[PDB]
Amino acid sequence: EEKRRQLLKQLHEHETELEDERKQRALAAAAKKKLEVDVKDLESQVDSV
Amino acid sequence: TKERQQKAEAELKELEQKHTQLCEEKNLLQEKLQAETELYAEAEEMRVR
Numbered sequence: 001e002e003k004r005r006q007l008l009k010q011l012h013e014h015e016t017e018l019e020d021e022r023k024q025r026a027l028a029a030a031a032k033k034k035l036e037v038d039v040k041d042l043e044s045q046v047d048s049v
Numbered sequence: 050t051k052e053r054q055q056k057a058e059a060e061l062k063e064l065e066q067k068h069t070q071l072c073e074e075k076n077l078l079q080e081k082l083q084a085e086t087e088l089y090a091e092a093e094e095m096r097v098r
Contacts (some may be wrong), residue, residue: 037090043098 037094040094044094047098
């Protein structure tokens, strides 16, 4: 029962910690896409200029 | 009581099959949605250009 409690606690903690990392991945990907759009916009500006 | 157990386990299995199905369909629709959003962005920015 104690082994169950320990392993379950570890699983829960490691899962929530890496879920926070997954949210950081989502944020990073959003920022990446935003900057990609900015690059395309600026490239269009350079074309016209 | 054993008959009711068997029925409860059958209902449980049915719900489990539908749960994993809906989860996979959700995943596929989310992936496809992200693709269509990217395609829309690519089309619209070039439309503006």
